[PDB]
Design brief:
Four copies of one chain form a homotetramer.
Chain A lengths: L5 H14 L5 E5 L3 H9 L7 H12 L9 E6 L1 H4 L9 H7 L3 E5 L4 E3 L7 E3 L5 H10 L2 E10 L8 H20 L3 E8 L7 H21 L8 E2 L16 H13 L8 E4 L6 H13 L7 E6 L1 H11 L6 H18 L11
Parallel strand pairs in A: 1-2, 1-10, 2-3, 3-6, 6-7, 7-8, 8-9, 9-10
Antiparallel strand pairs in A: 4-5
Helix pairs in contact in A: 7-8, 8-9, 9-10, 10-11, 10-12, 11-12
The structure holds naphthalene-2,6-diyl bis[dihydrogen (phosphate)] (4 copies).
Pathway (chains C, D): Carbohydrate degradation; glycolysis; D-glyceraldehyde 3-phosphate and glycerone phosphate from D-glucose: step 4/4
Subcellular location (chains C, D): Cytoplasm, Myofibril, Sarcomere, I band; Cytoplasm, Myofibril, Sarcomere, M line
Enzyme class (chains C, D): lyase
């Protein structure tokens, strides 16, 4: 009673490797209806199904310069079943440009009673049947987001254990259905903590994640990790260089992520488009041994400038697509250490 | 940042105590559509909504002799929103007879990959909103069933840990919504294992359950436990007395269940009606100290003869209700150690 | 492959029940040489082997009024091999008065690196052989003390897990050698935390303790628990009644201690002689259901006045023994709820 | 509350890297008195301190061809304080040849009650003081051996958790004293299980080991791992190539051992001299990515021919040393993948 056959393992490993192939990263376009509404609101655009469709089309149909930059695209359920103006389903559009289609499958955070505002994430019910259908409809990987926060009593032992366990359940169900799970334990940058505190918490969270994945018999070669970079908190007064951020990030990963993991696809969080590229580039130039692909799974850091240039106006299509292409090319170079605009750990 | 206020704790504790008050147990009538279908096929009756309504009505409207016997009734979702012939919602029927209304909220078992046929249970998604709605609609306690199996390499560490964890998540969400959770970690009797193997596994499962409930800040006084009795496997060749089953059961509970737990409501599993009554009565006569109510949460051990006597025929209503009443009375006496058919310590 | 046979289980259960039989508790006299030195220093007495022997003799040979009060006596290694003036080994003196002999077997606390001053406890190496010898030499139960502290980031997950685990190892070894283990996870009263914080930490620690005992296959009927009472911190500004202390303590125990545990023998900690008796009495009068004996395992709360009355002078023997008898009698009444000098909010 | 300062970290990391520098491995000569007795008995030699000293001297004073092969030497306590014929302490002999001195610090296995013959390991009591003394006396790394067995119900959850936890306690204490800990969770080859069963158990054990090291705040860059290679059981009838053994071994390590671990020093266990060299060579030629040194920490695989050529006779000194030197050279090439005498299926 092994969880997976050699054939199933090969399929998962091959998918995971395609997504993070050299020079490639992930466009994270899986904002739910409530979250994308706030993005559209920031440009005074109504949150209609058509406006959401057109915006996703804008990103997915950028010119072929993005093909070598984008190994995967994460979609929200609605977008997976939408079509471009030429009638092609968006999964077909993505594949025709050399991309793997991903689907976000979690159903949001819920409060953990007895904690200081901590959450876990729901979405396991009927997940297997959903994954089998998503697989039939063109998806080959999935995403599940857990959220943790650095504070006085947080993240607590309960929150670390519970989020690690539910990530492992999600990963197990995905792999039974031919879907590569992206494991996203995000530690929010909120607060005034410093770099080494983020590093400490990240190390503890990731140790818990991989012990849980082991307990649940997860095939690591058929997974990806989507962590926060190790950074000071948003309100931290002490300032750090990108090389220090890179060193703390790579050290934390080296202390917790088994080499069998196929790749690490960083979330951009609250970083600017340039900051996310500079940090990712510094991570890839960090002189330590890094036995996994180190690339991007960016939302805002790929979309910010495209969203503004668009402004909800059809005539700004080309201008908006150019901004996205410029960030896709930048981060493709960053994940190779080719982008130009220690014992203390 | 405590999970619950003193007012919320009092509500949950008062509910839990009402359900298992002396002489009272639970009617477990929460079979899902697929499971009740098998019950109806066994008496050649069609599985229609009306036949399900009629059958549930048959149990819930039995004469007032059941009132001091039934502290609680577990319903399936459909039944919570059905009505008796007089137009009364079934929850109002139950309450008017002194019972607390329960709702089963799990969404069935699912396979754990990498195990020898082991499962966990799903049903957490949107559970808080469901509990708030069920509370509004008259439910005060809930049920969630996890299933474990004694076998070669089972129950495994993973299966024990995961089922305990999901039970604790369910219990936490229930208590946030004023619903008393019934925690049901059922160890099936399938297999040829002997009595002391069942006792060992039951002790290990219950220790994991209560550590998980602690980790998730569960208020034990506002919970009930629905375990298997400790019995040999169905295929075991060695035979045991009811006194030995009782001693093994009470010993396992005394080694694992904190006295703050308000009550233990046993499942009947594959036991016959009489066997389940005799065993419960022996459990209550066991001379060891037992700091929780020890009563019943019975499905087939309350229903089997009523279902048969009914046979799907409206003219058999009174005869079917009489069979149910008889088992309700029997088990009311058994959960007091007062049941009669007339109506070594360190070896464990 | 059960850990114990029915015969080994009966032996352990019988011992545990003798120690905590109704009206009985434990004299904890197992201060090591460095700790008893501070006690003798407090009365201007030199810390010699003979002064330690004499002081322990004073306690162990008090008159027969203590016999129904004292179910057990915990000794330090040295004392287990000392003799009274009549030539009798101290274990024989204890047994002759109806007491079970206990031996402290831990080797003190050690720091946990990476923690905010937290410790675990050492003493497992060669413990099985030590237990076998102690059993031959008249001991039937043992004691092992872990120490946890309430503070900003303490007790940490690491400290709770590690102390629970080492207690389980100790208990397992003891039970293989016919010794009933007393499991002592002391949460110190140091600090300004309030009563509900102590209750919260005590509930979490004891849940960890009993999960570890389960994982290690410990026979609970052949164990005793020696916990702190649930009290405010020593420096807490909010004040509480003995009844609140009792309610918080009994509630924490009811939420964590399986009924199979044979007895709970409270440590006195920093409490005065009278405070420790009043609190134990209030615990036994608490109206909730308590399915285990609730009695005492007291050091200073049985010894403080005896030590002062002695003052190191052999001519104060009887006066000092009288002070210990008075506290033994007080606490025997208290563990029955017979001593006189909403639960949903917990 | 960080466990170590940057300076303490630098020292441990520097030591760890010196031991497993390219081409180098470890001579494991830390057999205790009882275990070396079995070795000497197999060559008809009396187990006296002098014969133990002479045999250890024979190994430690082998000619300078072993200097680039031997990065560290593990000694038993007795040997750390013995001297060569010329009066030089053995630690000075080792260092004068470019070797780091190691000390075995565990006190052997003890049974876990309630298990099917499983053990944990003892040795924590007073370990901090022992480590500080050993550091003073020339040791810079240590070894602690836990033993697990593949059987019907083994290794159990209890055995895995407890051995991982005690290994982490040992590692923590070592690092507080400037000693690099070698963590040895040996899964025995006993039994008739196949290669994938060993791989499965090895992955589960190592995942538990590294979670425990994380919980105890262990600095992984200042540690080494001494695991079993992944092999079929001794009584398994199915046959495997060295390339399959290598693939299963590297796959297991890639799934569990964080890249920050400085090196993996395989135990030889029951393997012959040639088999252990050939397997280590195939491990280093395995085409998968390996972010740690993969070298040897060998006892009998370095000593077997030398012990037999010696036969307890002083006049066989040079013939015996020659056999040891030949195996040090062989394994130095093997840990470089230069010794000569589908992946989804794992
Ligand atoms: O809860 P929902 O809004 O439905 O899901 C989310 C939540 C956060 C996200 C963040 C993203 O950017 P990045 O931080 O991954 O780079 C991209 C997509 C995201 C989708
Ligand atoms: O999965 P479902 O069938 O929908 O839910 C179930 C499963 C098992 C049951 C067993 C019962 O009898 P007892 O074993 O509690 O006495 C009573 C109700 C039950 C309901
Ligand atoms: O560390 P050592 O000194 O060797 O052992 C101790 C430590 C604390 C003690 C406290 C006591 O009083 P109580 O708290 O048990 O009532 C009695 C004996 C004690 C012995
Ligand atoms: O129990 P003790 O005898 O005191 O210690 C041991 C036990 C096993 C050993 C195995 C060795 O060979 P290898 O398996 O490390 O290659 C070398 C030294 C060993 C020492």
């Amino acid at each position: 009673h092994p969880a997976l056959t050699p054939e199933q393992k090969k399929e998962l490993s091959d998918i995971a490797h395609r997504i993070v192939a050299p020079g490639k990263g992930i466009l994270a376009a899986d904002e739910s209806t409530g979250s994308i509404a706030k993005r559209l609101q920031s440009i005074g655009t109504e949150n209609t199904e058509e406006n959401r469709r057109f915006y996703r089309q804008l990103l997915l149909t950028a010119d072929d310069r993005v093909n070598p930059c984008i190994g995967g695209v994460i979609l929200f359920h609605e977008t997976l079943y939408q079509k471009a103006d030429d009638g092609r389903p968006f999964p077909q559009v993505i594949k025709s440009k050399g991309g793997v289609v991903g689907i976000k499958v979690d159903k949001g955070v819920v409060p953990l009673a007895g904690t200081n505002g901590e959450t876990t994430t729901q979405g396991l019910d009927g997940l297997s049947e959903r994954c089998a259908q998503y697989k039939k409809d063109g998806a080959d990987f999935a995403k599940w987001r857990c959220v943790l926060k650095i504070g006085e009593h947080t993240p607590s032992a309960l929150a670390i254990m519970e989020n690690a366990n539910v990530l492992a359940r999600y990963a197990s169900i995905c792999q039974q259905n031919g879907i590569v799970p992206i494991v996203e334990p995000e530690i929010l940058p909120d607060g005034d903590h410093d770099l080494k505190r983020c590093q400490y918490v990240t190390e503890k969270v990731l140790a818990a994640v991989y012990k849980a994945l082991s307990d649940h018999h997860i095939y690591l070669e058929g997974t990806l990790l989507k962590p926060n970079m190790v950074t000071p908190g948003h309100a931290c007064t002490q300032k750090y260089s990108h090389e220090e951020i890179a060193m703390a990030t790579v050290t934390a990963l080296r202390r917790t992520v088994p080499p069998a993991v196929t790749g690490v696809t960083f979330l951009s969080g609250g970083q600017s488009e340039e900051e996310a590229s500079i940090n990712l580039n510094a991570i890839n130039k960090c002189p330590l041994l890094k036995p996994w692909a180190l690339t991007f799974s960016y939302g805002r850091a790929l979309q910010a400038s495209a969203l503004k240039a668009w402004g909800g106006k059809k005539e700004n299509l080309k201008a908006a697509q150019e901004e996205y292409v410029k960030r896709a090319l930048a981060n493709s170079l960053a994940c190779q250490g080719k982008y130009t605009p220690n014992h203390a750990y």
